[PDB]
Amino acid sequence: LRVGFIGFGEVAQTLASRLRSRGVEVVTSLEGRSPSTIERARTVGVTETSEEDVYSCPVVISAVTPGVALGAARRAGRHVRGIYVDINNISPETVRMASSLIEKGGFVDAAIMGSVRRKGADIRIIASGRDAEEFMKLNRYGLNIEVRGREPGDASAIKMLRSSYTKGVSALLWETLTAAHRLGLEEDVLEMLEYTEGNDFRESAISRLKSSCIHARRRYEEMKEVQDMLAEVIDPVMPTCIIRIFDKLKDARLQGCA
Amino acid sequence: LRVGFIGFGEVAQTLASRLRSRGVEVVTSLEGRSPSTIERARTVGVTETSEEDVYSCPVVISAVTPGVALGAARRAGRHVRGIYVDINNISPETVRMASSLIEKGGFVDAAIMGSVRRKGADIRIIASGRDAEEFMKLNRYGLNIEVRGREPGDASAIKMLRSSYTKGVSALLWETLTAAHRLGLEEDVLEMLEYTEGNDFRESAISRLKSSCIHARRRYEEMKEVQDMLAEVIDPVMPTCIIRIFDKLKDARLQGCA
Numbered sequence: 001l002r003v004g005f006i007g008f009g010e011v012a013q014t015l016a017s018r019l020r021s022r023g024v025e026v027v028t029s030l031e032g033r034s035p036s037t038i039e040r041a042r043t044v045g046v047t048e049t050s051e052e053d054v055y056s057c058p059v060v061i062s063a064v065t066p067g068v069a070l071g072a073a074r075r076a077g078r079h080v081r082g083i084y085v086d087i088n089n090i091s092p093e094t095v096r097m098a099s100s101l102i103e104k105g106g107f108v109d110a111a112i113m114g115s116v117r118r119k120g121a122d123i124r125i126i127a128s129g130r131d132a133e134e135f136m137k138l139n140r141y142g143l144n145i146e147v148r149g150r151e152p153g154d155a156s157a158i159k160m161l162r163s164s165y166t167k168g169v170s171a172l173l174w175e176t177l178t179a180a181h182r183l184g185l186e187e188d189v190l191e192m193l194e195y196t197e198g199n200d201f202r203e204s205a206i207s208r209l210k211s212s213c214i215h216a217r218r219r220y221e222e223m224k225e226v227q228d229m230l231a232e233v234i235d236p237v238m239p240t241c242i243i244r245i246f247d248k249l250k251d252a253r254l255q256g257c258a
Numbered sequence: 259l260r261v262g263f264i265g266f267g268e269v270a271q272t273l274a275s276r277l278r279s280r281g282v283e284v285v286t287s288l289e290g291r292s293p294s295t296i297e298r299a300r301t302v303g304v305t306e307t308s309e310e311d312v313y314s315c316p317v318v319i320s321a322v323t324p325g326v327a328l329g330a331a332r333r334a335g336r337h338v339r340g341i342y343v344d345i346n347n348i349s350p351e352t353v354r355m356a357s358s359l360i361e362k363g364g365f366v367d368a369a370i371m372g373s374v375r376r377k378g379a380d381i382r383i384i385a386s387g388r389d390a391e392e393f394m395k396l397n398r399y400g401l402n403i404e405v406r407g408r409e410p411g412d413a414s415a416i417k418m419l420r421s422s423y424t425k426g427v428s429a430l431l432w433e434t435l436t437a438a439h440r441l442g443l444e445e446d447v448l449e450m451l452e453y454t455e456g457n458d459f460r461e462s463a464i465s466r467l468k469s470s471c472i473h474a475r476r477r478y479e480e481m482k483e484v485q486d487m488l489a490e491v492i493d494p495v496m497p498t499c500i501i502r503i504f505d506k507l508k509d510a511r512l513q514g515c516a
């Protein structure tokens with residue numbers, strides 16, 4: 001059929017390109033969009049149309065910025081009658097609000113579970129909501145979707161919970177290795193760990209260490225979000241310490257000096 | 259030659275038994291020791307001798323209790339001229355002080371990296387200090403020693419750092435899964451984690467979770483020690499929150515209840 005995209009950045013380009021290569025007609029509205037967006041669209045060769053025509057597609061995918069997710073849902077919510085797929089990196093609470101704005105359509109919470117830069121359209125996408133199985137039918141056109149949870153908010157929650165764990169582990173590794181570094185024992189500690197944490201441990205370990213530091217500010221903000229989502233369900237103990245570690249984080253051994 | 263043991267409890271029995279079966283004469287002093295200790299000694303068949311005769315052995319191993327380690331070193335240090343191997347669970351700084359008490363001998367910081375109970379004499383032991391290589395010669399007699407670090411305190415630090423990391427991950431896992439459970443998403447989070455943490459994750463995680471809950475009381479006490487040990491080297495942030503989780507912890511899904 002036709003799949004319309006709200007926004008046409010990196011995610012929309014990768015996804016649209018794949019769908020197009022499998023015979024799907026992809027459409028987007030370029031009115032008011034930047035030259036970079038207009039160029040990605042023209043590189044892919046998507047159908048240029050009006051906003052309301054985009055909203056008429058049986059599947060509409062919102063791939064804008066986290067800060068624009070609610071506004072896109074509000075503008076689309078007045079017209080979309082098919083399925084509206086929000087694939088933005090937003091919190092479960094924001095997803096539920098976006099869902100309330102889609103008044104006549106079926107809302108699907110999609111969460112990208114990997115790097116679009118490294119995996120392309122083969123990236124694993126999880127989706128939740130009553131209409132998720134309908135979105136998953138796009139797997140016939142080259143996508144890699146899987147249905148998880150039961151309602152909008154669940155897919156984004158799984159992604160947030162996984163990310164929460166991985167950020168906490170990164171913070172723990174940093175504190176552990178800074179102490180090891182003061183004694184000159186970081187390598188020995190890393191080697192004792194590969195004994196019980198796995199074979200490919202040390203590799204991704206150093207990798208996560210470096211990125212946790214480069215993006216300390218961003219990771220800190222992500223942690224405030226996880227603290228809020230967890231509080232709705234439990235009384236969160238770990239985020240507070242993790243945040244303190246990221247607060248501090250503002251040749252891998254060089255990330256350990258202080 | 260002759261290996262002397264100060265203290266003759268579970269650790270000493272296990273190691274002495276292995277050494278004896280490989281032809282080493284093992285000796286210890288039973289004066290002032292309890293019935294259970296005298297019994298372990300006679301079950302193994304150790305040579306009963308004077309306190310000073312023990313100190314004369316080329317290798318003297320101190321396997322007493324943490325609260326007795328410094329006193330044992332003070333007494334042995336007036337006599338030992340061979341190698342004094344401290345295998346007690348004391349902080350790295352306590353090990354360094356025990357080292358200063360062996361005034362005429364070489365000191366080796368040995369650290370047991372597993373369960374004596376489950377692995378027996380096959381347990382991996384890491385050892386640090388100038389004379390660590392000399393202690394490692396006992397591998398010829400059935401032990402499993404490996405040299406790490408460079409000076410007394412390094413082996414104990416490495417052990418405590420590994421412990422700090424593995425206990426922190428258990429707490430992070432528990433909190434993440436308990437929140438996931440309240441949303442009915444625990445399996446999804448677990449599958450997403452193995453879909454990213456490579457290794458059999460889901461399995462290595464469910465077991466770590468179970469053990470952490472079963473032994474929550476001991477884990478809590480163990481974390482207080484880790485916190486104190488980390489404090490000798492840095493101003494630790496993570497143990498505070500980790501301790502709060504173990505404070506709470508006192509079919510996998512059953513454990514996720516806060």
Ligand SMILES: NC(=O)c1ccc[n+]([C@@H]2O[C@H](COP(=O)([O-])OP(=O)(O)OC[C@H]3O[C@@H](n4cnc5c(N)ncnc54)[C@H](OP(=O)(O)O)[C@@H]3O)[C@@H](O)[C@H]2O)c1
Binds near residue numbers: 008034072
């Ligand atoms: N890239 C990744 O690896 C990745 C991974 C996981 C999740 N995500 C998520 O998926 C979403 C899209 O990511 P992305 O990298 O493609 O972003 P870009 O930020 O790469 O592209 C989004 C593009 O959305 C447009 N936009 C902003 N406001 C808009 C509005 N009111 N109406 C229509 N379009 C609007 C922009 O057009 P203009 O340029 O003209 O403003 C923009 O091109 C994000 O929410 C992000 O968190 C991305």
Ligand SMILES: NC(=O)c1ccc[n+]([C@@H]2O[C@H](COP(=O)([O-])OP(=O)(O)OC[C@H]3O[C@@H](n4cnc5c(N)ncnc54)[C@H](OP(=O)(O)O)[C@@H]3O)[C@@H](O)[C@H]2O)c1
Binds near residue numbers: 324
């Ligand atoms: N068991 C393990 O899996 C394990 C693992 C890692 C580290 N460690 C450490 O290694 C050491 C020994 O462990 P363990 O399990 O064998 O303990 P026990 O507690 O099994 O044995 C210690 C034995 O030391 C003796 N002792 C107490 N005060 C003494 C003194 N002043 N002089 C001489 N002997 C004295 C006792 O004699 P009495 O019975 O007469 O009191 C005692 O048998 C400890 O520091 C412990 O923390 C043990």
